[PDB]
Scaffold this active site. Structure first.
Site, short mmCIF file in Angstrom:
data_model
loop_
_atom_site.label_atom_id
_atom_site.label_comp_id
_atom_site.label_asym_id
_atom_site.label_seq_id
_atom_site.Cartn_x
_atom_site.Cartn_y
_atom_site.Cartn_z
N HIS A 1 81.94 43.66 20.78
CA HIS A 1 82.15 43.88 22.20
C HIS A 1 82.91 45.17 22.50
CE1 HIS A 1 81.79 42.16 26.20
NE2 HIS A 1 83.05 42.48 26.45
N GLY B 1 93.85 41.90 25.66
CA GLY B 1 94.05 42.73 24.50
C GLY B 1 94.20 41.99 23.19
N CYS C 1 91.78 40.28 21.79
CA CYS C 1 90.49 40.24 21.14
C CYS C 1 90.55 40.94 19.78
CB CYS C 1 89.45 40.90 22.05
SG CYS C 1 87.72 40.68 21.58
C1 LIG Z 1 93.26 36.19 28.78
N1 LIG Z 1 92.62 36.25 27.48
C2 LIG Z 1 92.64 35.30 26.57
N2 LIG Z 1 91.93 35.75 25.52
C3 LIG Z 1 91.48 36.98 25.82
C4 LIG Z 1 90.64 37.85 24.89
N3 LIG Z 1 89.89 38.91 25.56
C5 LIG Z 1 90.30 40.16 25.46
O1 LIG Z 1 91.28 40.42 24.83
N4 LIG Z 1 89.61 41.13 26.04
C6 LIG Z 1 88.52 40.86 26.74
N5 LIG Z 1 87.75 41.93 27.38
C7 LIG Z 1 88.17 43.31 27.14
C8 LIG Z 1 88.68 44.07 28.20
C9 LIG Z 1 89.10 45.40 27.98
C10 LIG Z 1 89.65 46.46 28.81
N6 LIG Z 1 89.85 47.51 28.04
C11 LIG Z 1 90.39 48.78 28.48
N7 LIG Z 1 89.47 47.22 26.80
C12 LIG Z 1 89.00 45.96 26.71
C13 LIG Z 1 88.49 45.19 25.64
C14 LIG Z 1 88.08 43.87 25.85
CL1 LIG Z 1 87.44 42.91 24.49
N8 LIG Z 1 88.11 39.60 26.83
C15 LIG Z 1 86.91 39.28 27.58
C16 LIG Z 1 85.70 39.21 26.64
C17 LIG Z 1 85.82 39.55 25.29
C18 LIG Z 1 84.71 39.48 24.46
F1 LIG Z 1 84.80 39.81 23.14
C19 LIG Z 1 83.49 39.06 24.96
F2 LIG Z 1 82.42 38.99 24.11
C20 LIG Z 1 83.37 38.71 26.30
C21 LIG Z 1 84.48 38.79 27.13
F3 LIG Z 1 84.38 38.46 28.45
C22 LIG Z 1 88.79 38.63 26.25
O2 LIG Z 1 88.41 37.51 26.36
N9 LIG Z 1 91.91 37.29 27.02
#
Ligand SMILES: Cn1cnc(Cn2c(=O)nc(Nc3cc4cn(C)nc4cc3Cl)n(Cc3cc(F)c(F)cc3F)c2=O)n1
Ligand SMILES: Cn1cnc(Cn2c(=O)nc(Nc3cc4cn(C)nc4cc3Cl)n(Cc3cc(F)c(F)cc3F)c2=O)n1
Lengths: 301, 302
Positions: free
Chosen positions: B41, B143, B145
């Protein structure tokens, strides 16, 4: 997303754990720079453990009576000293993985991470809080003596606890890194009782805020109260009295939720005067008091 | 004395966590030998996270589009490939802090330690169980992930989980270290439902044995039961059905306490039909189901 009891990563502390043997008495030690810190109880034979004369036991010891090893590596002892209940063994090698660190003495209600060790080998990590009666409710077996508790801020490890003994109620007692006990206990194999424990009220309120900040909101009500009126109810239920500083500390959590501290105190009063309706808050059916206000904000960002 | 949720020491895993950036999309990666593993992702821009064509997105990426940072050391990406939902970036420097490791796929009901990371820096560690519906109930922020879950066997690190996303329920979903999701989820920002969860029966029974070992004995009663009669009650309270393999697993805990497994089932049946009446077991007012039989042995002995 989520709310868990969360410990600090233990790698910086793992690099500091060593085994200390004196005769057949074995425990864990903490290796920082060229000093190894361990409980002075190591100089006690089985027949000295009940009523040791630590002044006389140590005067008769020499450097070569202390065997320290960091895994397979042996550390030669070139000096030893006693500071309160902590033995200090000067070694010829400075620990190459010595982290940035400080020795601090924590207050009741404050939390830290515990690295349970056996024979100088880390075994598990979990979080504890210093109880108002100056005990901790950890998970320790025989051989855990000398395991440490700590907090980490910006790569600096603050060592705050060294485990010493298990009490009859199953709770655990220990010292700071300067050898001074938390609570009125002494380093001797005698039955020592902790006082009646009370509940950390400010922590319970912080945990209630985390619930709303997550989702649980059924416990919120329409009432408010005064610090004086709540503390009257708090005293009856073996709860710590709430101070204005406690009220001030909970300010940030109160801001994010729009729930006045004294409004939450009224909600807590009702939960105590009636019950939890057998319903759950944040996945628990009891009131949790081992989350500080700081623990909540750092997890509910 | 005492019984707590206890994670493995995280030192060996801490030395493997790096930051991966692709444009502005940022997450955590795992650095083992000369390879960095991270969720694919990362190659999504903001406008791609809803329905990405990962093969189309990957074909337009080059090595230098991936920034990999190990603390303050910058790593050099000399190749990249895609395996299921996991992206693999080969670097010019093998990780010196690489521990003896292994990739494994756990079963529902097994536990592991999670090292939560943000921007490639470890932040905290806790224990999780793989729910019967293949979700995990953890604590993850934006963050996180790319954080990993693991067990340790003496000196070998068994990686079993890489975090991907939070679901509508607030539960968490991820993959193994070959990119295959646990459960029926997909790596895209779309509403996804996880099935109804069930309670891990064998883990509750193991927890009850731990209470006996620690001096909490009030729930032991005058009854016994059969495996078939217990599953009638278990299916009723949304519990997993108990198998003969579960009975065999609980053998050691049975022998150490002298309490037969079927006897403990009957005490559990009674607890399920009458509640606990304001009493607690091991300091909890609920039936805990996230301690495996191996977790109890590791903590109550050795
Ligand atoms: C609240 N929470 C609980 N667990 C998580 C894990 N998580 C995450 O850390 N990040 C995500 N989206 C990103 C946004 C970004 C913005 N920038 C600048 N860089 C980013 C990188 C990421 Cl990965 N997500 C959402 C998400 C991550 C995925 F790997 C996926 F396949 C689908 C998704 F909707 C996320 O859930 N956050
Ligand atoms: C069940 N439990 C929970 N916590 C503890 C901690 N603990 C411990 O680990 N060891 C202790 N006594 C020793 C015996 C030894 C036998 N050999 C061969 N070597 C030994 C070393 C020690 Cl330290 N104790 C008891 C204890 C330790 C003290 F430091 C003290 F001041 C008073 C005490 F009664 C112990 O509690 N076990």
């Amino acid at each position: 997303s989520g709310f868990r009891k969360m410990a600090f990563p233990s790698g910086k502390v793992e690099g500091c754990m060593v085994q200390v043997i004196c005769g057949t008495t074995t425990l864990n030690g903490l290796w920082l720079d060229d000093v190894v810190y361990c409980p002075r109880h190591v100089i006690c034979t089985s027949e000295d453990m009940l009523n040791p004369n630590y002044e006389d036991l140590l005067i008769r010891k020499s450097n070569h009576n202390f065997l320290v090893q960091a895994g397979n590596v042996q550390l030669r002892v070139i000096g030893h000293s006693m500071q309160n209940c902590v033995l200090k063994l000067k070694v010829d090698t400075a620990n190459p993985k010595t982290p940035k660190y400080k020795f601090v003495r924590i207050q009741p209600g404050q939390t830290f991470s515990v690295l349970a060790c056996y024979n100088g080998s880390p075994s598990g990590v979990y979080q504890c809080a210093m109880r108002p009666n100056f005990t901790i409710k950890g998970s320790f077996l025989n051989g855990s003596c000398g395991s440490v508790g700590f907090n980490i801020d910006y790569d600096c490890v603050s060592f705050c606890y060294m485990h010493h003994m298990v009490l009859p109620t199953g709770v655990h007692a220990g010292t700071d890194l300067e050898g001074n006990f938390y609570g009125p206990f002494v380093d001797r194999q005698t039955a020592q009782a902790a006082g009646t424990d009370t509940t950390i009220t400010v922590n319970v309120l912080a945990w209630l805020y985390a619930a709303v900040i997550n989702g649980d909101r059924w416990f919120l009500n329409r009432f408010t109260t005064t610090l004086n009126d709540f503390n009257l109810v708090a005293m009856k239920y073996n709860y710590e009295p709430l101070t204005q500083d406690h009220v001030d500390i909970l300010g940030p959590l109160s801001a994010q939720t729009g729930i006045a501290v004294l409004d939450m105190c009224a909600s807590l009063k009702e939960l105590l005067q009636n019950g939890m309706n057998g319903r759950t808050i944040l996945g628990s059916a009891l009131l949790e008091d081992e989350f500080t206000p700081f623990d909540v904000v750092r997890q509910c960002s």
